[PDB]
Design a protein around this ligand. Structure first.
Ligand SMILES: COC(=O)c1ccc(-c2cccc(-c3ccc(C(=O)OC)cc3)c2NNC(=O)CCCC[C@@H]2SC[C@@H]3NC(=O)N[C@@H]32)cc1
Ligand SMILES: COC(=O)c1ccc(-c2cccc(-c3ccc(C(=O)OC)cc3)c2NNC(=O)CCCC[C@@H]2SC[C@@H]3NC(=O)N[C@@H]32)cc1
Lengths: 120, 119, 119, 120
């Protein structure tokens, strides 16, 4: 299932609980792995996916503020979970920083992360 | 107080949100487009201690397009910033991912942009 | 004739383009923002036999941000559609990738949207 | 170098010439590999990249019309070339279809392709 501990290709750790009715809740950490590296996340997933072999759509957000650091920015990941022997979450993400209006054109980075349950 | 309220976008969609002191966003979304009807749950996060220079407040939220009436097997995330003042706005870009087979994964994700106006 | 001409976007940038019968786009771009000065070469492609229903004409182009004056070690692609008529527009989304090291590759690419008006 | 024959994870083939002053020109084909699968591409690249170990920025466009088929759509790839023993082009792409104004919200797909010179 979705619930568990996931790792992406940057060594970030994504610890998530999937609620019965579609909630995602947990913590997202950089590869450093200490308290300063950890941030709250919340999101949603399709809690009744199709039964035709399709993945399970989901998304979540981290705002990059914790008790140690604030980068004045937020990332959202949008993607799908694929179960089976080597479960995976395949995502694309948007990382928006707070900017002036003049700098808004360079406010948003885009990328892609793939998560598995294999600890590096 | 700034983020909390009712917002409409350029497509006529409805975003009702409460911003909590801990950085939480919670509310409901009604889409003007696509395989959707009635309200959907949303959840997200925002920077609860934004810069006090002249920059926006970063935020994001997710809707999974399942409620008690319909299920589109998909989810949208909006990533953007809130700009306060007399004419408050939230400027976003979004990613809408559908659950797909592996063979269709290459075309799972739509991208676009929405601007919300506070009402 | 429709696409061919001079276009400005919401940031004040200048897009001069010729659309060839074979689907080619060729021209020059002047950016209002970023590490850029004077004109840059652009090249792209468009659908030279678009639908004749009420839909836009798909197109895209690239600028590498190197000319004889400056080099930002980056390139933007715009992907979008042309809508003709008395008030012609090109509505685009864009990706701006910088050359990076491997360690910085995760933050190589900006995304946004530009609307162009024909003048 | 960039000039040569590349393949992505979908088995598409990207045959490109990189001109001295920044032009990219060539053909892009689906995994089917026949005439009907092939389309013209043009783009640009940084013809004087940094010398600090950074990749080479580039982009290109395909409009999905040839003498056989027309999908009324265009893809742009934006990314970077990384040289060395296993050269790679890492990209993100935007695929826009011509739509009515009412359907413009669902006009644009986003994804990512990685290219190598290894023929599947
Ligand atoms: C007023 O002060 C500031 O404005 C300020 C202060 C400190 C730092 C800072 C300094 C060093 C490192 C980070 C950092 C780097 C990476 C990660 C990370 O990947 O966490 C998962 C977290 C923090 C720093 N913060 N940067 C962030 O919080 C943004 C992290 C974005 C990570 C992105 S999300 C998409 C992609 N997927 C990942 O797993 N990671 C990347 C930035 C800004
Ligand atoms: C009036 O008629 C129409 O509107 C019409 C007619 C036929 C078809 C059609 C039918 C079957 C297959 C294709 C097709 C599929 C894939 C590829 C391909 O990947 O080529 C590289 C090309 C064509 C078909 N066309 N589709 C396209 O040309 C779009 C291909 C988009 C491929 C994307 S670019 C990003 C990503 N990276 C790749 O390498 N491939 C994918 C679509 C529309």
């Amino acid at each position: 299932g979705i619930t568990g501990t996931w790792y992406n290709q940057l060594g970030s750790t994504f610890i998530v609980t999937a609620g019965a009715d579609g909630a995602l809740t947990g913590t997202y950490e950089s590869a450093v792995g200490n308290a300063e590296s950890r941030y709250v996340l919340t999101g949603r997933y399709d809690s009744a996916p199709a039964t035709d072999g399709s993945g399970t759509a989901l998304g979540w957000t981290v705002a990059w503020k914790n008790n140690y650091r604030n980068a004045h920015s937020a990332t959202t990941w949008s993607g799908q979970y694929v179960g089976g022997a080597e479960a995976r979450i395949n995502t694309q993400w948007l990382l928006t920083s707070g900017t002036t209006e003049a700098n808004a054109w360079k406010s948003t980075l885009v990328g892609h992360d793939t998560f598995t349950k294999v600890k590096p």
